[PDB]
Amino acid sequence: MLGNLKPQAPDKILALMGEFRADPRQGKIDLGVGVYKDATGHTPIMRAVHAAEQRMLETETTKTYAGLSGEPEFQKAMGELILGDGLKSETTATLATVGGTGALRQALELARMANPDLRVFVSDPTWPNHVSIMNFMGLPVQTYRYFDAETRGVDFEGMKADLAAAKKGDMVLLHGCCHNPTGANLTLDQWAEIASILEKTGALPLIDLAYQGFGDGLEEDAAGTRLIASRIPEVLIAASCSKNFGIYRERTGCLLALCADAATRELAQGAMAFLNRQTYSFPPFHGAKIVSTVLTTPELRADWMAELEAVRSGMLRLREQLAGELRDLSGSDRFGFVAEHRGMFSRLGATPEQVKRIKEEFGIYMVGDSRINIAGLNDNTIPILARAIIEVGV
Amino acid sequence: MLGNLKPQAPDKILALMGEFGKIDLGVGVYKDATGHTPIMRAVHAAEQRMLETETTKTYAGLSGEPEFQKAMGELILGDGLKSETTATLATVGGTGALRQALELARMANPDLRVFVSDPTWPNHVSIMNFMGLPVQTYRYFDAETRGVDFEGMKADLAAAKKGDMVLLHGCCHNPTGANLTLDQWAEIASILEKTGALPLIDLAYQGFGDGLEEDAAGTRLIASRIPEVLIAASCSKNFGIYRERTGCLLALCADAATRELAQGAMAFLNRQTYSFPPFHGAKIVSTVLTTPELRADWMAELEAVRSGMLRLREQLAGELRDLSGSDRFGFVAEHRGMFSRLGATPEQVKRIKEEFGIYMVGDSRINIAGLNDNTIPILARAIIEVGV
Numbered sequence: 115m116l117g118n119l120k121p122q123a124p125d126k127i128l129a130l131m132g133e134f135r136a137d138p139r140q141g142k143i144d145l146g147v148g149v150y151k152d153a154t155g156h157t158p159i160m161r162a163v164h165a166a167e168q169r170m171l172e173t174e175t176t177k178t179y180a181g182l183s184g185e186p187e188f189q190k191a192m193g194e195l196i197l198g199d200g201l202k203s204e205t206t207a208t209l210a211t212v213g214g215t216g217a218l219r220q221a222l223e224l225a226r227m228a229n230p231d232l233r234v235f236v237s238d239p240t241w242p243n244h245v246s247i248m249n250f251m252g253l254p255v256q257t258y259r260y261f262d263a264e265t266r267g268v269d270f271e272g273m274k275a276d277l278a279a280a281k282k283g284d285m286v287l288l289h290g291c292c293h294n295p296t297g298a299n300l301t302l303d304q305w306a307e308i309a310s311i312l313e314k315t316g317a318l319p320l321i322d323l324a325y326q327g328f329g330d331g332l333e334e335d336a337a338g339t340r341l342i343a344s345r346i347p348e349v350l351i352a353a354s355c356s357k358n359f360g361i362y363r364e365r366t367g368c369l370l371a372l373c374a375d376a377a378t379r380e381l382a383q384g385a386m387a388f389l390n391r392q393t394y395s396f397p398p399f400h401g402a403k404i405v406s407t408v409l410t411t412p413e414l415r416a417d418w419m420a421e422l423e424a425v426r427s428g429m430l431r432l433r434e435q436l437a438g439e440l441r442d443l444s445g446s447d448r449f450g451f452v453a454e455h456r457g458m459f460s461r462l463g464a465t466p467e468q469v470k471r472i473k474e475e476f477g478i479y480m481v482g483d484s485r486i487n488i489a490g491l492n493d494n495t496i497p498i499l500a501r502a503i504i505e506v507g508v
Numbered sequence: 509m510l511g512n513l514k515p516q517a518p519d520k521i522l523a524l525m526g527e528f529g530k531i532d533l534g535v536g537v538y539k540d541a542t543g544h545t546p547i548m549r550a551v552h553a554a555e556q557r558m559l560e561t562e563t564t565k566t567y568a569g570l571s572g573e574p575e576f577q578k579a580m581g582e583l584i585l586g587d588g589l590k591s592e593t594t595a596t597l598a599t600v601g602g603t604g605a606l607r608q609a610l611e612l613a614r615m616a617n618p619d620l621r622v623f624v625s626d627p628t629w630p631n632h633v634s635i636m637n638f639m640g641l642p643v644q645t646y647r648y649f650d651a652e653t654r655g656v657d658f659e660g661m662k663a664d665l666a667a668a669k670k671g672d673m674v675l676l677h678g679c680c681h682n683p684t685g686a687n688l689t690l691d692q693w694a695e696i697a698s699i700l701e702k703t704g705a706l707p708l709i710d711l712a713y714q715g716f717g718d719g720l721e722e723d724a725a726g727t728r729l730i731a732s733r734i735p736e737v738l739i740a741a742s743c744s745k746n747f748g749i750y751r752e753r754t755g756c757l758l759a760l761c762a763d764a765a766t767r768e769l770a771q772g773a774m775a776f777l778n779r780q781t782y783s784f785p786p787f788h789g790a791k792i793v794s795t796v797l798t799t800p801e802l803r804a805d806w807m808a809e810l811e812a813v814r815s816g817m818l819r820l821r822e823q824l825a826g827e828l829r830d831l832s833g834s835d836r837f838g839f840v841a842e843h844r845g846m847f848s849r850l851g852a853t854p855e856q857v858k859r860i861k862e863e864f865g866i867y868m869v870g871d872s873r874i875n876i877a878g879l880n881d882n883t884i885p886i887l888a889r890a891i892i893e894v895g896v
């Protein structure tokens with residue numbers, strides 16, 4: 115029977131990897147990585163996280179089945195981290211998931227469960243995995259303009275014009291912050307206008323909050339999400355702990371369902387629990403327990419925020435340096451967007467030809483859409499990348 | 509939108525878990541003399557070693573780690589493990605393995621039907637219903653003898669067609685405790701090859717029946733006979749890491765080409781559902797399995813659990829014998845595994861819990877691991893008073 119199976123395409127993160135490894139050049143650089151790496155090219159385990167694991171190893175006495183939709187400590191801590199004081203426990207349903215991707219997949223299953231004729235609007239461009247999951251589910255996908263290739267900023271007028279076509283019951287996927295892959299983000303004022311269009315259309319917003327803490331700060335990064343949450347009755351939020359907690363492989367995510375009333379909340383919470391049951395019964399415990407422990411233990415929460423802040427500031431300085439280098443070389447402020455972008459990613463706006471030419475002549479690797487990871491940069495690699503960009507005529 | 513969500517039916521077994529001189533005999537979790545589900549010695553040592561050795565938590569393998577895949581393949585199939593034709597996928601527990609098994613099969617056969625034992629783990633049917641798969645049932649439990657109705661099973665299975673899937677419990681049949689002998693297994697292999705039905709084996713209690721190797725005997729027999737077979741394994745109960753969510757799906761194929769196809773489709777399945785599988789439990793398992801000292805202590809502890817439960821069954825049988833003045837309840841000593849169904853009707857079961865404080869699943873399924881010297885005679889007497 116298994117012979118009838120249609121061949122499925124590989125990730126692609128590995129094809130780029132195999133090519134990079136095969137390159138015999140001593141000065142080759144990899145800006146295609148999708149995770150944070152420090153100065154030494156390593157992805158460390160955050161201090162507070164290692165502290166939580168030592169703590170868990172000494173206090174945990176059992177590993178019996180726990181909470182179906184997650185542990186209360188985790189659900190509450192995550193809700194407070196994302197929504198702050200605006201958290202309305204009475205109308206908020208929460209579900210621990212297998213990473214942010216699991217939260218996204220579940221959000222989609224939940225929405226389709228409530229609205230079979232669901233259509234989803236995604237940004238142009240967006241995290242490729244969004245479309246993949248949606249295509250796999252058979253969901254109708256619609257695109258809304260977002261990245262302005264020329265200014266490398268947000269084409270807001272276009273975004274607004276396209277979103278205006280959304281009908282009641284449709285879902286609009288928004289990146290809460292640090293837009294992957296572009297790095298171009300909405301201002302709080304633009305968020306406010308988006309809220310108006312959403313109220314008008316009656317479209318359900320799904321916020322992908324995977325980088326809270328890498329933009330302008332923990333609270334700052336959740337600002338857009340909190341505005342949407344307070345002005346829109348029903349809101350779906352799929353959060354990730356992979357990057358901001360540095361526990362990628364542990365698979366710790368969270369799905370928040372903001373409902374108009376408690377009756378609906380019980381309905382949503384029950385359906386979410388049912389969704390976990392029919393997929394894998396219970397969600398992973400380890401990562402979630404690390405998170406709730408860090409968040410509930412003052413000493414740890416403190417050290418964690420301090421390490422995240424150091425990380426954010428470090429990347430922000432890398433941006434400033436690159437932008438300055440490019441300013442000095444270009445004799446213009448065209449590349450200023452690099453210092454305006456937020457997150458660990460940025461789309462340079464180079465064409466595939468320019469991308470290939472950069473690799474061949476300078477040994478610098480990056481995603482085919484010209485997306486680079488700022489964390490993979492440093493004092494020694496910045497001058498090289500800058501010169502490369504100018505030389506290939508970007 | 510969300511206001512249109514219809515209410516869902518709760519999990520009956522896990523419902524009692526919430527409801528609980530109370531005596532918990534419900535959820536299939538191993539418990540010790542003091543009513544505690546402990547962390548196995550080797551598992552604890554493994555976690556301690558992991559804390560010292562892990563330097564990063566970056567994304568790892570989409571299909572799981574090679575170490576985990578290999579160790580698990582060896583634990584299950586032993587020397588019958590043909591890597592060139594075996595695709596392995598780390599999953600979110602055994603339940604995740606089952607779901608992923610059904611998705612893989614449906615992709616290869618949009619019109620597949622699934623044959624399940626009468627009765628079977630309720631969660632088997634709930635998932636199939638959710639997915640919208642046609643479910644047929646085959647006779648298995650003999651309510652009279654409390655054993656297996658093998659004649660009925662053979663009859664019903666012979667009616668299966670190629671492309672269909674037959675779900676079998678590798679050992680320690682949940683919820684009955686009634687198991688097939690190796691001769692009956694060989695007989696089943698004949699039917700499977702004659703009909704061309706794809707076997708899906710749920711292996712959740714390897715080590716709780718007659719032993720690690722012995723509990724895999726039937727699975728190894730089907731794997732050597734049938735060219736294509738799926739195995740959904742759980743590390744929740746035999747490693748005592750229930751909440752970690754670790755298990756794996758093994759896809760045995762006739763050739764390397766099909767193996768490549770299956771492997772790719774399985775990786776794709778994880779990617780579209782939750783991206784990467786959880787690392788913590790899988791790492792604990794491979795660490796135990798690949799470290800001689802740890803594997804040895806683990807096998808010893810698992811054997812102790814096994815022997816202990818077996819002792820309990822005999823105690824319960826004896827106690828009941830004295831009180832009933834008969835041996836009707838003899839079946840309790842012959843059943844193998846964590847569970848055993850008595851026979852008490854729904855009303856009797858309910859009366860028992862509402863006054864005696866002893867909770868057992870509605871179909872009279874009891875977790876023998878929940879008993880001990882003190883509670884056994886109490887239970888025995890309680891069933892006598894509830895009569896029939």
Ligand SMILES: *Cc1c(COP(=O)(O)O)cnc(C)c1O
Binds near residue numbers: 214215241354365366
């Ligand atoms: C990382 C990421 C996710 C989810 O990460 P998980 O590893 O599944 O926790 C979701 N959306 C975006 C945009 C991301 O960058």
Ligand SMILES: *Cc1c(COP(=O)(O)O)cnc(C)c1O
Binds near residue numbers: 600743745
């Ligand atoms: C335990 C069990 C499983 C798997 O449970 P997980 O906690 O998901 O590992 C599957 N089937 C049966 C019959 C079981 O008893």
Ligand SMILES: O=C(O)CCc1ccccc1
Binds near residue numbers: 519535537603
């Ligand atoms: O009690 C059981 O049958 C095994 C434990 C279990 C029950 C329901 C969902 C997952 C695991």
